[PDB]
Design a protein around this ligand. Structure first.
Ligand SMILES: CC(=O)OP(=O)(O)OC[C@H]1O[C@@H](n2cnc3c(N)ncnc32)[C@H](O)[C@@H]1O
Ligand SMILES: Nc1ncnc2c1ncn2[C@@H]1O[C@H](COP(=O)(O)O)[C@@H](O)[C@H]1O
Ligand SMILES: Nc1ncnc2c1ncn2[C@@H]1O[C@H](COP(=O)(O)O)[C@@H](O)[C@H]1O
Lengths: 561, 562, 285, 276
């Protein structure tokens, strides 16, 4: 059980196809009835074997602060969290919202939750009072944990609920410290199928729902991720990614701590300083770096002769496609291939260009053998022809380990899991050597700037404005953000289409929505293309935008910001 | 136009029809209800003026024997002494008044005084516990409270030591006041039509009970729809069998009869309904229009019905639950009357109904009242255009119908009920090829035992108050007598063993916390509750399992029926 | 209960077919029963399929045996006796057991059904003294035989097979039930003019108690009435006796004399079963 | 053109070569895009024009039991079935195994299935636990329907697969009745090419496979059969065949009910007694 990860860690130091398959087989034979990744892996293969190796190197590029934590200090610090939580009467399964910046105490809380068998809800720091109140309606908090920078937002969204509140940095009235109880509490003997994580994620139909992950799905699924990423024990590993999302669990937390590596974490407020971040990469001698194509696109526009990166060995991308031209520029300069790979909040990494895999540009590589990946056509028959597009699906008998339990929405489960497959809602084709190529969403779900965006959620917030009668939100091609959020608005009788109105509505949306969700374009239209029932055909809104692009024509009341 | 409306309406009542209904509809739309006060404008200005000395109320208590008769005049006087006495104790417009009494003239009196004085009345039922009442006070603080002497201690204990003015409708008690102390002349409050006069605490599927907010027109003028479906006239003696703290008392014991200048008949009884004696009193008092709930109706038809003639009875009606086709038929075959079912919620007035002129199809609540825009929507929220297709009963909001509440005192609950231009009733139905509606059931987990709406969480909560109870799930189980039974599934804490004596001990505790209708009639102890991936109780599968067990007439291993 | 059987290492176990029927539905790989050597059933017939499932698993035959309150065991598959499924075995030599026909002559031919009787000269030892009721003695003790009121046939090896009651006595869930007792209790409801209680086939409980009720003038047939009457019966009758079905009828089939044909109420139920219909005023609980 | 069947029925009362050819040509001009033989032929022609003609005369030569059903009573009885199935949550295309003796309720269920757009899998009464398990491996049941004589075989072949189960004669624990619902359910608007029947047939190479029939292939193909057979409306028509095969549909069901005849059905257990 312990022996498994020691074999895994070796696999990493020189991986290949064949040895991967052995790893695969061995996972199937783990006994995972009672499992707790902190106790069993963190504490019993790292705190014990490398307890005073650096687990985490942290740095805030604004403040300048640095902090360095060994596997020991980190395990202690996390126990003080879990002791403090338990002291405030937190039983197993209790809900804990976690909204903090990148900071050691983030990792700490992660650990305390996993160990204590709590349900953590990662909450992003750019979430609005509105978004947070939505979350509370859907899943009531037993405790919430914030930094002092976003305490007001939680305080306001909470309103008049009893919860236990906690600050990771600084004091605030009726908030508590996390390091003031004893750094000894015991494991919760968790079932491997027990819930530890809920991720609110956007869908194509309704408001965002919780994706449910267990004490093995992420803690042991992340193998697939770690394996594609090619993170080793020797590595100093950084993931450019934010605090409320899956990619952090993926590569800022699980994948590095699985293999006993040194995590590198960098915090910044506001806008990313491309140069400053890359300076901190080189300056801290990171060896493995995962960043999103959004970031990569911005990096390659720097003067890259200002860097050596002698210490950097692995570079990876995920969440959107990776332009062949990006890959090439970075290679020609630093002699490294940015290895793209694929997955969702609902899963771990499912497909990827592994270290040992020859990259074909604009291909996310081949399936990880721990997922049974199939292209299905519209009728749900399996595609076994090259260059034919279909739905990316996961075969459910046997049920892969890294796959979420389901959504907190039983209807959405009925749409996504069926005839013994889970549909990712992504479309692709494969080639003659089994390399997969991402085509796009079969959904109306949007990805601006490596953020998953649900239409209804923006449409909803739009109907909050007195002027707005109807709204349809679609994503439009943009080289920098992949997609832009555009809104079609039908106006109530009484209001007329002006730029000043468009702006007024946008500024309203800024108080209700996460920035990435606030439409960059607004177009007033007399009506929305609809089916006979009255369902919006967001498909045809998109097609129409395309034909308009090819004749460089603006809509009559289309307002760009 | 404003007085003339009611005079046109009262005629529609004496002989109604499709076409003349539509005219009534149109005329309501052209009322000026910007500043309106139903007591001044209708009670006083029409009824007290034109029929001041006709009997407004005939009252009887079947237990005590006590009886009363009040004319529209005496009642208006009586009500003014109330309003004068309230004002004397410093009651301004919008002030909250809990009213917890038996059926009694002074109840009507207070209703009037409240509406006229522009106060916010909170109808409170007489079977509410100290606990329930304290909950209410946490949610809305009382400026004054009004009780009978039978439930004064309950108010006194739930109050604790809040400042309030207190009032007794029958007898003396220390620090309680009389309501007939000041002069029977104090003036209307000029209410806006949208001003609040009523708040109703109602159960939901999700949490503790919240307030439904009604205005000086929503009930006082919405009730038209009700009165119209009911078919109450001026010449009628109209009895509604309903208890004091709920929307149906307003609907049929108060507004619908007094709108059309009828004689109200009010019958009070404590405790358990004596079907044989109540129907004897109906006949004996020559009621002519009778609303009763299907629960009552179900009990009546089991009598030997050759005991009664019902010489004087011409209209019979039901509301609040479905009305079994077999009930309708038995009563018809005997007395040659159709019991007309009709539909609505605390949140509304009557929205759908078998009107007097409408051919009844049994097990249908009839057709929508044209003063509400009723739509069946499917799951995606698109309007249903096909017979025998089930969907959500909704109210279209532009324009906003008149009898519809303002909203809940809870903004989360408003966000659920008011969506994409529709207020969802959370009821499901299908219509037929002639546009008759058939009730299917709740989209919710809300329960209706014995014509009382019951919230699961409320009872689940009270159950966790018992040391032994680790988890609880409260569902309604099919029951012919009360439509649904409140059953609790209980997971036990380690230490306590599933026994009849334990089930009882828990139940008797729940009796001190919960209104009787809420106290589970069954308690079944289980190892676990079937759950989704979320942790949410599959009340779905609890019901399916109950069904398979019913077909083998077997109880669960530790299911205790009381 | 099965856990406690194993846990206490019982070696001989007698339960009724009702129990046995319920046991075989369990997942029976939970149990070893390493200490159990004898298993027996009595009070109603023992389905061949029950016997088989228990044998295939635990390697024991559930040995059926027959008797009544009035007696001790009169017929039975003894330990040494090859069990033929659906047979209660052979007569115990301390009772003189005879199949008689309706005319009271002894049946000596295989596969012919008759009344199970006990020959009384000399009088077997385990046989009750009689009833405290002289009428009931007149019916049971006749021409030097006690009639059990059970019907059976024997085969070519003298093995007895249960057919059913020649009475109107009912056996729900291994409890013997009298019609008149339930009919009596039913007259206690003001609405009830007459009542006829019969048993209807049920695989779980052998028979269900059904009541046919004629109503007094004034009351009309409803489900709500049926229920009201049943709930009343619950306060008067042991639960096994409380009718699971109530059917309102205009009249009860009668002979020329006016005697209720409970026989024909049963036959009618059978014809209805064979076209899978429930009745027009039959209310199932 | 439903006038087709009225022309067909007459063709039957006195056929010949020439008039046959007309029938042929008229079938080619049918609109079979949306079709439902129960609604369109059974109900709309026969129940309407001869509702109180005897549809079925039934006898069990072993028990003695006999039944006589008019086109009306049969249509009602079938609706009770379909109502009951729907009540247990049966959508169109759902699989229904049907294993019963020759009995009225068999025809009833046939009708309910065709009307309700279900996929029926006729299963003969002599099929073993093994053979039935094979069937379930190949196509999973949503519901199964048996007589009480073969309930244990279904129960055992199922093991504990979730299905709705139904008995045509008698009660049994966790089996449901078919006539406790309403005497009217609405037609399923079937496409003509929609599947309503699957028949497990033996072949040379493997274990048995399913033959797939549609809402027209049998319900309208049977014409050819009915025309060769020469069955008329006036006739009392008996087909000696067993319940889980094509020849039952062919001649105990479709060919007679196409032309509005009286079906005669005889049930026996065990070996055929040719002189009785
Ligand atoms: C067991 C007991 O004492 O029963 P008891 O309550 O006195 O009733 C006696 C009646 O039980 C029935 N009965 C008893 N044993 C049976 C068996 N092996 N097979 C079938 N029926 C059986 C008969 O019908 C008896 O006449
Ligand atoms: N390599 C990739 N190329 C294109 N899209 C990707 C890639 N990796 C992930 N995605 C998208 O990211 C989605 C999941 O979003 P999230 O759950 O936020 O990681 C997938 O459904 C894809 O649509
Ligand atoms: N006639 C009726 N038939 C069926 N359900 C009804 C009927 N009237 C009321 N109900 C139910 O009772 C609810 C009204 O609750 P209340 O606010 O207590 O009157 C409705 O939302 C229905 O779901």
């Amino acid at each position: 059980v312990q022996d498994f990860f020691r074999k895994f860690i070796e696999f990493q130091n020189s991986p290949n196809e064949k040895s991967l398959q052995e790893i695969v087989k061995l996972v199937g034979q783990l006994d995972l009835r009672r499992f707790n990744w902190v106790r069993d892996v963190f504490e019993d293969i790292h705190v014990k074997e490398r307890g005073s190796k650096t687990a985490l190197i942290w740095r805030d590029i604004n403040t300048g602060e640095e902090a360095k934590l060994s596997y020991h200090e980190l395990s202690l610090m996390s126990n003080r969290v879990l002791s403090t939580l338990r002291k405030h009467g937190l039983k197993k399964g209790d809900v804990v919202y976690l909204m903090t910046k990148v900071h050691p105490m983030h990792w700490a809380v992660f650990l305390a939750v996993i160990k204590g068998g709590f349900v953590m809800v990662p909450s992003a720091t750019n979430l609005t009072v509105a978004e947070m109140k939505y979350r509370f309606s859907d899943l009531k908090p037993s405790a919430i944990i914030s930094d002092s920078l976003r305490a007001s937002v939680m305080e306001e969204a909470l309103g008049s609920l009893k919860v236990e509140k906690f600050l990771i940095d600084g004091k605030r009235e009726t908030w508590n410290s996390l390091e003031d109880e004893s750094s000894n509490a015991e494991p919760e003997d968790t079932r491997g199928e027990d819930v530890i994580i809920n991720y609110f994620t956007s869908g194509t139909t309704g408001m965002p729902k919780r994706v449910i992950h267990t004490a093995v799905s992420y803690p042991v699924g992340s193998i697939t991720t770690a394996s594609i990423v090619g993170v080793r024990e020797s590595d100093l590993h950084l993931n450019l990614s934010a605090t409320g999302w899956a990619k952090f669990a993926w590569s800022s937390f699980f994948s590095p701590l699985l293999v006993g590596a040194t995590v590198v974490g960098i915090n910044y407020e506001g806008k990313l300083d491309t140069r400053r971040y890359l300076g901190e990469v080189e300056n801290l001698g990171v060896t493995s770096f995962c960043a999103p194509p959004t970031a990569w696109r911005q990096f390659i526009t720097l003067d890259l002769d200002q860097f050596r990166f002698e210490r950097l060995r692995s570079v990876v991308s995920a969440g959107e496609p990776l332009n062949p031209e990006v890959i090439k520029i970075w290679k020609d300069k630093f002699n490294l291939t940015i290895r793209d790979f694929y997955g969702q909040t609902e899963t771990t990494a499912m497909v990827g260009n592994f270290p040992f895999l020859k990259v074909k540009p604009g291909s996310m590589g081949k399936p990880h053998p721990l997922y049974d990946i199939r292209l299905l056509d519209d009728e749900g028959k399996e595609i076994t022809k090259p260059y034919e597009v279909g739905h990316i699906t996961v075969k459910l008998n046997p049920r892969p380990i890294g796959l979420f339990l389901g959504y907190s929405d039983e209807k959405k489960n009925m749409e996504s899991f069926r005839e013994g497959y889970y549909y990712t809602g992504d479309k692709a084709y494969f080639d003659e050597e089994g390399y997969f190529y991402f085509v796009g969403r079969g959904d109306d779900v949007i990805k601006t700037s490596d953020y998953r965006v649900g239409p209804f959620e923006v449409e909803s917030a739009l109907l909050e404005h007195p002027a707005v009668a109807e709204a349809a939100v679609v994503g439009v091609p943009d080289t920098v953000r992949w997609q832009l959020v555009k809104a079609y608005i039908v106006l109530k009788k009484g209001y007329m289409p002006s730029k000043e109105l468009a702006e007024e509505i946008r500024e309203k949306m800024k108080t209700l929505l996460s920035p990435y969700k606030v439409p960059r374009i607004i177009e007033f239209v007399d009506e929305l293309p609809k089916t006979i029932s009255g369902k919006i055909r967001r498909v045809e809104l998109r097609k129409r935008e395309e034909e308009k692009r090819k004749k460089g024509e603006v809509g009559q009341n289309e307002y760009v910001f």
